[model samples]
Target: KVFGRCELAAAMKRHGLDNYRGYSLGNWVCAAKFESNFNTQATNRNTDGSTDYGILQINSRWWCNDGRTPGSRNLCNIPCSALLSSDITASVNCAKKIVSDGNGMNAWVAWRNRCKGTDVQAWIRGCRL
Candidate 1:
């Protein structure tokens, strides 16, 4: 599923990651950088070549022990699919909880300001957004 920027923003707001929601959108983005690099659909193989999958780079083994392994072909783990399914809103939410409450917003903000070539984060952070 494809989640637009506005939709992701709205979902973040709903999940308490906006200024009006008592969560810090700035910090949330920061954590995402370390977690996903904002890929929104990233998955990786574990040391034993197990599939530790999903957009947030969430390891299914962390939550789904009898989970999908690497080279499964279908590329679907329950927890992995749970995160990456529907839309990246869930993935973003996962990042929020896994990385830091709403500090993951800082990852989004950094992508907005520095990576995506947008100046909003810079503008907002400069003024304490």
Candidate 2:
């Protein structure tokens, strides 16, 4: 499922992304934009053999078990495949765990490079939330 910007914004807000760990809805939206372009099935494989999965791009190395990544922690305790679901509930929940684990939004390079310190209000400008 590919989500329009406002649609994704509404979904994230509903999942408590707004003000999550002090990161606003715009920040989350911005991260998602750069990470997966709101594509629920997006996946990227790293040079180290770890894979990023789903809208938020949760990584297999540390978050989800893909049955392939070396030394995977599977801290999210979920199959990496779950992140690719259109429902996005798994992705959102894992994302919250990631930030709450003290990594902050910096866990995603896309967020650090694109959303951090930027005025992201425009990302959610047209959204009613």
Candidate 3:
């Protein structure tokens, strides 16, 4: 599903990402903007042979098991395909795990480059969260 900005905001908030791990809803919204543009089915294959899955693009090498990424840790203990569902429950859960795993929001480079240290409030502006 390709969520509109407010729709994604409400969904993330419902999943408890509004202030999860000290990152606000805007941070997540901003990350989603760059990570997958709110597309639940987005996937990006890295040069290292690991594939990023879903809206937040949880990785195959360290987070989810795709049965294809070599040496996958599967730290999230989820099948990578689960992240692609439009429901977004699995993806949000994995994202929470990623933040709690000491990587924080920096686990996503897209977040670091675009959302980090910025006034991300604009990402969620006008959204009736």
Candidate 4:
């Protein structure tokens, strides 16, 4: 079964998008497609949370929901790659919220850039996504 809007929201919640600054349904889907192929149930287990797990492959090692409800301390890591097959919308949106203010597609242009390693901070500033 393909993921719908409600599925996206569930996936986003799974990745903790609700804890982001400006979580969006559209931007998240866009990036999730680019990152995890829209696998809303993706996950990776490693020494540290990397940029390859969960829906958005958010590494989650550096991210943390300080202002939001729940967040990751590490938003980038090897495990982040798990996003490769997650729900495209929710996953990508989570990434954007972690890097940019949750509005990634407009805030950073996710499709135009290549995400790598625990370098979410760099991607947000340098790649603008």
| Residue 82 error, candidate 3, Å | 0.6
lDDT of 3 by residue, 1-129 (tens): 999999999999998889999999999999999999999999999999999999999999999998898887998899999999989889988899899988799999999998899999998899887
Candidate 4 versus the native: TM-score?
Answer: 0.37
Which lDDT values do the candidates have, in the order given? 0.47, 0.92, 0.92, 0.45
Name the runs in model 3 displaced over 4 angstroms.
none
Ranking by TM-score: 3, 2, 1, 4
Supply the TM-score for candidate 2: 0.96
The whole-model C-alpha lDDT of candidate 1 against the native structure comes to 0.47
Candidate 4 per-residue C-alpha lDDT over 51-129 given as tens digits, one digit per residue, 9 for 90 to 100 = 3455454545454222222345534332333344433443444465456644343433344374422233322232211
Residue 112 miss distance in model 4 (angstroms):
4.6
Candidate 1, residues 1-129, lDDT tens digits: the string is 434344444555566666533335544443344445545665666677554434345555443333445334322323566665656555545554544534433433334455343333432253322
Error of 1 at 120 (Å): 13
Residue by residue across 24-76, what tens digits does model 2's lDDT show? 89999999999999999999999999999999999998899999998779999
Error of 2 at 113 (Å): 0.8
